[PDB]
Design a protein around this nucleic acid. Sequence first.
RNA 1: CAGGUCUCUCGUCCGG
RNA 2: GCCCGGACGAGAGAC
Length: 461
Amino acid sequence: GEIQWMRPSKEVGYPIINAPSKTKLEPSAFHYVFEGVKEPAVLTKNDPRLKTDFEEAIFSKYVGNKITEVDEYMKEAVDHYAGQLMSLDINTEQMCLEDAMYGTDGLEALDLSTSAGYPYVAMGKKKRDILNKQTRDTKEMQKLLDTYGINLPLVTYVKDELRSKTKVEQGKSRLIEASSLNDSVAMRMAFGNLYAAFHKNPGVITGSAVGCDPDLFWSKIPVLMEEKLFAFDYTGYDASLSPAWFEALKMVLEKIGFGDRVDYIDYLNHSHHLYKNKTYCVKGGMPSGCSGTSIFNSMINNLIIRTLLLKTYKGIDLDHLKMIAYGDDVIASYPHEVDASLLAQSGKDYGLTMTPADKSATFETVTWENVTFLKRFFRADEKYPFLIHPVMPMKEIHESIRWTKDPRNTQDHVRSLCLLAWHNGEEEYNKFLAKIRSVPIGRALDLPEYSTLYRRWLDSF
RNA sequence: CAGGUCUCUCGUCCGG
RNA sequence: GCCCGGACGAGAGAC
Ligand SMILES: [Mn+2]
Ligand SMILES: [Mn+2]
Ligand SMILES: [Zn+2]
């Protein structure tokens, strides 16, 4: 992905949009009980903890477009992936405006608690004004659709979230793209039946984990993988995609029956954004925040991964590839062992910076011991070895609990962390409860017992 | 009061 | 006891 032009948004007829400049993250009652290296991310240029120019750091991720032409291997990839999705029998119809708006089986309703983007954002108009869940009223949305049309610009925002130290000092904050309510509606009418199919089918046919529940899906994953594993994350995924990959995606869509609306994908591939005063244009790069972000990322991953095998391993049989993606996050297997360092080296030709799934510095051999998917480890149960724990490191849970966006959420927050931490086992779970209860507010919370969570887990099978 | 697209789960409240 | 559905809030995860 690459920035085409930044100019005062005054010159282009666009309003100045000014986001909040303050973190909503105050430190938690458990701030000193537990340790951690994470602070809220840099939101503005005037941040003391910055050791670099902010605005140059945030947009740093637009590294350019390596390729623009779907090569022969991308084409065999496209062929094989799209052949996979055929079996799903994915309904290819437009989805009616009422469902695009208020949800249907496999597709949730639009989030009435997040903004309506451009232009509503600068009119002081919100989704609640336009949408009505009780009534499922599509009338005022249609009127807005007629009036403002689609292909509206996205409003860039810095994500208010916890960041490492180097990420605060290097102003490496994450930026989302606030899709307009019009395009979310437009995109979901076009693609809603595809999003639903994906949601309903996490696994190796779709190559996607969107729609999974790790408590239950971890027990499935090993039975779905072939004998030898490899795995990756990527560096700056969305913005490291060059136009070639969008044409490859357009190509998958056409082959599965979405030919007519493949144009929308061009509006993703060439997008306009509003950022504070500026107005800028991007070519390549996934507009994270647009409808389908997750699904298109994971789909492009499946292509990227087939492509790189075909190039690196002559005669590789993609029919014995098994892979699951959640955006750039991927776990994959093949009947014979493949080399992630090599695969990652070809990936650079296509503009991809690839890594170990833990953002570790160097690729190891990947075993059912070191492999991680979505930050979690895999550990067989000791009584029931076919049932597998999603084991997230206590380090992570520690980092979270030390902060709050609002003190009145402590019960839910900590309670939620308990449902992650007990997979580390009774001995580690009870130490957790001890530390939590080491403070007076801790002794106020209703926390679940190891044994209760264990029987819940087993019962849920 | 400002900050996207989603998935999953938990919690609160209301239903069949 | 067991299903199932809705509204709202939170946490985690991907971008
Ligand atoms: Mn990444
Ligand atoms: Mn990732
Ligand atoms: Zn443009």
